[PDB]
Amino acid sequence: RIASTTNQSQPYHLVKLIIPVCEKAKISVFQLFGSDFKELGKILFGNFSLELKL
DNA sequence: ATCTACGCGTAGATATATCTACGTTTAACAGTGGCCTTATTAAATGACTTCTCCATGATCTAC
């Protein structure tokens, strides 16, 4: 939330923020930076067993 | 390799930034009826101290 409230052009701390975030999301860094928004959303919804569909 | 200067990493101190949100029921009522025990009985039996312990003087009798 802080990273999304601060200026978006500001870089994010890799090991401090992104790697733990994708870790808790059960998502590889490759999947996060490579897949499009549709695939990422579908995989996130399946990972947390949500019923959403983007 | 060594002396000297300087730019940087870093730790400490400090000001800042954090979007929704609002409106959160207005109305009218908060039982109207009637009763609030009718009968009957208000004990029937028998017992209501049980006992001593008397006071005083005439008389008998022993020393």
PDB file of C-alpha atoms (C1' of nucleotides) in Angstrom:
ATOM      1  CA  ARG A   1       0.000   0.000   0.000  1.00  0.00           C
ATOM      2  CA  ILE A   2       2.838   2.407   0.808  1.00  0.00           C
ATOM      3  CA  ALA A   3       4.605   1.521  -2.451  1.00  0.00           C
ATOM      4  CA  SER A   4       1.347   2.196  -4.332  1.00  0.00           C
ATOM      5  CA  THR A   5       0.767   5.511  -2.510  1.00  0.00           C
ATOM      6  CA  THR A   6       4.276   6.873  -3.024  1.00  0.00           C
ATOM      7  CA  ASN A   7       5.234   8.109  -6.480  1.00  0.00           C
ATOM      8  CA  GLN A   8       4.959   5.279  -8.996  1.00  0.00           C
ATOM      9  CA  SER A   9       8.105   6.386 -10.835  1.00  0.00           C
ATOM     10  CA  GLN A  10      10.037   5.729  -7.619  1.00  0.00           C
ATOM     11  CA  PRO A  11      11.803   2.343  -7.834  1.00  0.00           C
ATOM     12  CA  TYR A  12      10.859  -0.502  -5.510  1.00  0.00           C
ATOM     13  CA  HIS A  13      13.317  -2.347  -3.280  1.00  0.00           C
ATOM     14  CA  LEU A  14      13.776  -5.718  -4.973  1.00  0.00           C
ATOM     15  CA  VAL A  15      14.615  -8.088  -2.119  1.00  0.00           C
ATOM     16  CA  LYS A  16      12.796  -6.029   0.517  1.00  0.00           C
ATOM     17  CA  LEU A  17       9.486  -5.703  -1.343  1.00  0.00           C
ATOM     18  CA  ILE A  18       8.951  -7.523  -4.646  1.00  0.00           C
ATOM     19  CA  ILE A  19      10.508 -10.912  -3.863  1.00  0.00           C
ATOM     20  CA  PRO A  20       8.609 -11.380  -0.552  1.00  0.00           C
ATOM     21  CA  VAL A  21       5.420 -10.096  -2.195  1.00  0.00           C
ATOM     22  CA  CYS A  22       5.523 -12.618  -5.037  1.00  0.00           C
ATOM     23  CA  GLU A  23       6.634 -15.240  -2.507  1.00  0.00           C
ATOM     24  CA  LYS A  24       3.515 -14.787  -0.369  1.00  0.00           C
ATOM     25  CA  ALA A  25       1.456 -14.641  -3.566  1.00  0.00           C
ATOM     26  CA  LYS A  26       3.063 -18.031  -4.375  1.00  0.00           C
ATOM     27  CA  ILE A  27       4.232 -16.551  -7.688  1.00  0.00           C
ATOM     28  CA  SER A  28       7.671 -16.692  -9.261  1.00  0.00           C
ATOM     29  CA  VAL A  29       9.441 -13.486 -10.255  1.00  0.00           C
ATOM     30  CA  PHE A  30       9.433 -14.857 -13.807  1.00  0.00           C
ATOM     31  CA  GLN A  31       5.642 -15.181 -13.729  1.00  0.00           C
ATOM     32  CA  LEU A  32       5.233 -11.708 -12.219  1.00  0.00           C
ATOM     33  CA  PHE A  33       7.388  -9.885 -14.778  1.00  0.00           C
ATOM     34  CA  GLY A  34       6.603 -12.069 -17.798  1.00  0.00           C
ATOM     35  CA  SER A  35       2.919 -12.958 -17.924  1.00  0.00           C
ATOM     36  CA  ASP A  36       0.328 -10.453 -19.102  1.00  0.00           C
ATOM     37  CA  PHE A  37      -2.379  -9.006 -16.870  1.00  0.00           C
ATOM     38  CA  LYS A  38      -4.917 -11.675 -17.846  1.00  0.00           C
ATOM     39  CA  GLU A  39      -2.621 -14.606 -17.054  1.00  0.00           C
ATOM     40  CA  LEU A  40      -1.342 -12.966 -13.865  1.00  0.00           C
ATOM     41  CA  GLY A  41      -4.873 -12.265 -12.654  1.00  0.00           C
ATOM     42  CA  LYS A  42      -6.089 -15.774 -13.457  1.00  0.00           C
ATOM     43  CA  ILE A  43      -3.124 -17.385 -11.697  1.00  0.00           C
ATOM     44  CA  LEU A  44      -3.563 -15.135  -8.652  1.00  0.00           C
ATOM     45  CA  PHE A  45      -7.275 -15.966  -8.445  1.00  0.00           C
ATOM     46  CA  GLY A  46      -6.535 -19.681  -8.720  1.00  0.00           C
ATOM     47  CA  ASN A  47      -3.751 -19.408  -6.145  1.00  0.00           C
ATOM     48  CA  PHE A  48      -6.055 -17.777  -3.587  1.00  0.00           C
ATOM     49  CA  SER A  49      -9.109 -19.749  -4.795  1.00  0.00           C
ATOM     50  CA  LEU A  50     -11.025 -16.575  -5.618  1.00  0.00           C
ATOM     51  CA  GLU A  51     -14.003 -16.578  -7.975  1.00  0.00           C
ATOM     52  CA  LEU A  52     -12.950 -13.458  -9.883  1.00  0.00           C
ATOM     53  CA  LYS A  53     -12.328 -13.411 -13.636  1.00  0.00           C
ATOM     54  CA  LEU A  54     -10.568 -10.490 -15.316  1.00  0.00           C
TER      55      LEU A  54
ATOM     56  C1'  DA B   1      54.774   1.330  -1.499  1.00  0.00           C
ATOM     57  C1'  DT B   2      53.530   5.406   0.995  1.00  0.00           C
ATOM     58  C1'  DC B   3      51.710  10.048   2.121  1.00  0.00           C
ATOM     59  C1'  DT B   4      47.869  13.036   1.664  1.00  0.00           C
ATOM     60  C1'  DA B   5      43.430  14.762   0.099  1.00  0.00           C
ATOM     61  C1'  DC B   6      38.659  14.029  -0.879  1.00  0.00           C
ATOM     62  C1'  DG B   7      34.260  11.924  -2.080  1.00  0.00           C
ATOM     63  C1'  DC B   8      31.116   8.646  -0.340  1.00  0.00           C
ATOM     64  C1'  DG B   9      28.482   5.224   2.865  1.00  0.00           C
ATOM     65  C1'  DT B  10      26.229   5.526   6.609  1.00  0.00           C
ATOM     66  C1'  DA B  11      23.774   6.565  10.742  1.00  0.00           C
ATOM     67  C1'  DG B  12      21.042   9.948  13.107  1.00  0.00           C
ATOM     68  C1'  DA B  13      17.341  13.509  13.145  1.00  0.00           C
ATOM     69  C1'  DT B  14      13.248  15.348  10.925  1.00  0.00           C
ATOM     70  C1'  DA B  15       9.206  16.603   8.193  1.00  0.00           C
ATOM     71  C1'  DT B  16       5.794  14.443   5.625  1.00  0.00           C
ATOM     72  C1'  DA B  17       1.925  11.411   3.729  1.00  0.00           C
ATOM     73  C1'  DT B  18      -1.595   8.542   4.197  1.00  0.00           C
ATOM     74  C1'  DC B  19      -8.091  10.473  -1.560  1.00  0.00           C
ATOM     75  C1'  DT B  20     -13.565   9.022  -1.277  1.00  0.00           C
ATOM     76  C1'  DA B  21     -18.265   9.881   1.249  1.00  0.00           C
ATOM     77  C1'  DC B  22     -22.958  10.450   2.447  1.00  0.00           C
ATOM     78  C1'  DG B  23     -27.709   9.707   3.781  1.00  0.00           C
ATOM     79  C1'  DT B  24     -28.211   6.036   7.699  1.00  0.00           C
ATOM     80  C1'  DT B  25     -36.010   6.729   7.640  1.00  0.00           C
ATOM     81  C1'  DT B  26     -39.320   9.874   7.369  1.00  0.00           C
ATOM     82  C1'  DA B  27     -45.629   8.622  10.181  1.00  0.00           C
ATOM     83  C1'  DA B  28     -49.206   6.542  13.065  1.00  0.00           C
ATOM     84  C1'  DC B  29     -50.547   3.265  16.669  1.00  0.00           C
ATOM     85  C1'  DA B  30     -47.898   0.288  21.677  1.00  0.00           C
ATOM     86  C1'  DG B  31     -55.361  -3.201  22.689  1.00  0.00           C
ATOM     87  C1'  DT B  32     -59.890  -2.430  22.286  1.00  0.00           C
ATOM     88  C1'  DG B  33     -64.360  -6.214  26.731  1.00  0.00           C
ATOM     89  C1'  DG B  34     -65.921  -9.166  30.369  1.00  0.00           C
ATOM     90  C1'  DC B  35     -64.923 -11.964  34.653  1.00  0.00           C
ATOM     91  C1'  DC B  36     -60.583 -11.858  39.414  1.00  0.00           C
ATOM     92  C1'  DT B  37     -64.271 -18.253  42.359  1.00  0.00           C
ATOM     93  C1'  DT B  38     -68.510 -20.381  42.812  1.00  0.00           C
ATOM     94  C1'  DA B  39     -70.075 -25.002  48.291  1.00  0.00           C
ATOM     95  C1'  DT B  40     -68.507 -26.630  52.849  1.00  0.00           C
ATOM     96  C1'  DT B  41     -66.265 -28.072  56.821  1.00  0.00           C
ATOM     97  C1'  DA B  42     -63.645 -23.479  61.181  1.00  0.00           C
ATOM     98  C1'  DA B  43     -62.234 -30.699  65.210  1.00  0.00           C
ATOM     99  C1'  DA B  44     -63.544 -34.680  66.527  1.00  0.00           C
ATOM    100  C1'  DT B  45     -61.595 -37.239  73.521  1.00  0.00           C
ATOM    101  C1'  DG B  46     -59.697 -37.946  77.728  1.00  0.00           C
ATOM    102  C1'  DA B  47     -56.769 -36.515  81.196  1.00  0.00           C
ATOM    103  C1'  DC B  48     -56.297 -30.082  84.667  1.00  0.00           C
ATOM    104  C1'  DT B  49     -51.786 -33.324  91.148  1.00  0.00           C
ATOM    105  C1'  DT B  50     -49.265 -37.410  91.727  1.00  0.00           C
ATOM    106  C1'  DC B  51     -46.060 -37.685  98.092  1.00  0.00           C
ATOM    107  C1'  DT B  52     -43.821 -35.492 102.611  1.00  0.00           C
ATOM    108  C1'  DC B  53     -41.987 -32.643 105.014  1.00  0.00           C
ATOM    109  C1'  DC B  54     -47.511 -30.191 110.946  1.00  0.00           C
ATOM    110  C1'  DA B  55     -47.178 -27.017 115.541  1.00  0.00           C
ATOM    111  C1'  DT B  56     -47.684 -27.190 120.299  1.00  0.00           C
ATOM    112  C1'  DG B  57     -48.478 -28.693 124.596  1.00  0.00           C
ATOM    113  C1'  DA B  58     -49.368 -32.540 127.898  1.00  0.00           C
ATOM    114  C1'  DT B  59     -47.161 -36.430 129.446  1.00  0.00           C
ATOM    115  C1'  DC B  60     -43.606 -40.246 130.152  1.00  0.00           C
ATOM    116  C1'  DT B  61     -39.304 -41.177 131.715  1.00  0.00           C
ATOM    117  C1'  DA B  62     -34.231 -41.156 132.902  1.00  0.00           C
ATOM    118  C1'  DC B  63     -30.734 -38.916 135.781  1.00  0.00           C
TER     119       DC B  63
END
